[PDB]
Symmetry: D2
Subunit: 103 residues, 4 copies
Amino acid sequence: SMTFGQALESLKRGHLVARKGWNGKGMFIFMRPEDSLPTNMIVNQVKSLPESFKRWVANNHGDSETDRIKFTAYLCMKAADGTIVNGWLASQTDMLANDWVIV
Amino acid sequence: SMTFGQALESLKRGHLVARKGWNGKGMFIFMRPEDSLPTNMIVNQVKSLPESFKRWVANNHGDSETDRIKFTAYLCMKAADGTIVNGWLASQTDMLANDWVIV
Amino acid sequence: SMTFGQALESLKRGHLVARKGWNGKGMFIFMRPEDSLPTNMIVNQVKSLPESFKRWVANNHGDSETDRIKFTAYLCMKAADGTIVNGWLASQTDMLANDWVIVE
Amino acid sequence: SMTFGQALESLKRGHLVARKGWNGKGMFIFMRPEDSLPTNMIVNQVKSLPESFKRWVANNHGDSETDRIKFTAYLCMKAADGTIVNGWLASQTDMLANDWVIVE
Ligand SMILES: Nc1nc2c(ncn2[C@@H]2O[C@@H]3COP(=O)(O)O[C@H]4[C@@H](O)[C@H](n5cnc6c(=O)[nH]c(N)nc65)O[C@@H]4COP(=O)(O)O[C@H]3[C@H]2O)c(=O)[nH]1
Ligand SMILES: Nc1nc2c(ncn2[C@@H]2O[C@@H]3COP(=O)(O)O[C@H]4[C@@H](O)[C@H](n5cnc6c(=O)[nH]c(N)nc65)O[C@@H]4COP(=O)(O)O[C@H]3[C@H]2O)c(=O)[nH]1
Ligand SMILES: Nc1ncnc2c1ncn2[C@@H]1O[C@@H]2COP(=O)(O)OP(=O)(O)OC[C@H]3O[C@@H](O[C@@H]1[C@@H]2O)[C@H](O)[C@@H]3O
Ligand SMILES: Nc1ncnc2c1ncn2[C@@H]1O[C@@H]2COP(=O)(O)OP(=O)(O)OC[C@H]3O[C@@H](O[C@@H]1[C@@H]2O)[C@H](O)[C@@H]3O
């Protein structure tokens, strides 16, 4: 029986959480961790980034091996249809509710 | 310092809080309390409701004085230019940060 | 058959909208208009604001009846249980979907 | 001179956009594409997923190569400090503003 703050602390430590009051059933959220990536790994090896961004990186940072760019950790959801939503966001209700549970 | 969860519990108790790492300076968030409002007061009293809502409420809930609709608590922000942003939303960075302070 | 951008334009013009793909049924969103409010009203007469805020306003702006503070427009939801959630949030799915429809 | 809806259409088409009225400077948002990934890859190959999720996938989608899971597209922000914020959020101000601009 938890607040959003305890759910967040639980997420930071790599757990799965959910709210009883959600409309969809069988969902949970989780954290994806932070990582620092070499810039030329971004420009040349990463499939999941748009070309526009890769071009901007090349333009403003370049191909130095030393240079690395940090990707922040963030929340994701296993939604009701079984898809993974990157970037889960907390509604006002999620934030002030106290019906969070560990899954 | 403080996590977002402690900031949330602190907001539930009516305090103003803010993050050091925010781009704009001099800001803070606070909570607007929850309230239950009569359908009469909704259809006929409130300036801040669109007609479409007032009409939806009329065609549904009706004239009963007893009928009430709960308007929920929610977060608001005193922004850098001094405007009050209703319905402040927490970014991923905000949620995972531990640089919250009581204001 | 609308995008989120078209749905937002409908909202700005005072309509109710919804996504077919939402889990909860019978929900919709609407926009609550912006307003400029007198500093005195906020500090002395507004029931829905917390005291910490009323105290901050008083220190920051004295009440002259000409000093006004702007409260922004924002989106709200009639939720599945019939309560009104102020401050509705658009999920990544909400934002990228094209299953928006107008509700009456 | 753009609404959030136009900025979103531009994002879905691979452009970088930003708001004039943001406090931080030099920031922009972009979309990360959706992809469908086989279960076996998720459990055994992807490192940027927590172990509890990989286990859930193993327990639920099984050991099959047949099963695939869809990872949705989503918005990301290049922040004022040059870090890439995954899962960028549209504030009430963002969604109702008409000061969006294409940056690349
Ligand atoms: N745009 C905007 N205007 C604001 C805001 N806060 C206050 N106002 C204005 O201040 C008036 C009086 O506010 P009140 O004393 O809280 O008196 C309010 C309040 O007690 C109640 N009410 C309406 N919606 C809500 C809500 O979401 N939450 C709560 N707690 N009360 C609400 O209805 C009463 C009458 O509402 P109105 O006729 O609209 O009259 C409102 C509206 O003209 C705001 O954040 N944005
Ligand atoms: N569309 C999509 N595909 C996904 C997603 N999660 C995993 N994948 C796929 O799984 C591949 C391997 O992921 P990885 O082992 O984490 O290997 C990744 C990961 O180590 C890293 N990476 C890139 N962006 C990020 C990020 O934002 N955060 C983290 N933590 N790592 C990232 O770069 C490596 C190579 O990236 P890719 O070439 O994209 O290669 C990714 C992409 O093929 C997702 O949410 N969406
Ligand atoms: N596919 C998806 N992508 C991103 N987020 C998703 C999602 N499915 C569920 N969520 C989120 O998970 C919590 C409740 O889940 P639900 O109660 O099942 O939500 P739903 O009834 O569909 O309403 C939807 C409304 O809820 C809000 O986001 C919810 C909310 O934080 C958001 O404001 C949306 O407009
Ligand atoms: N007028 C306003 N109305 C609503 N919310 C506002 C706001 N001013 C600031 N915020 C929010 O407050 C926190 C940090 O504040 P900032 O660091 O000043 O953010 P900013 O650089 O303006 O970028 C803006 C980006 O940050 C995120 O919203 C921020 C973020 O939650 C969101 O993703 C947006 O795209």
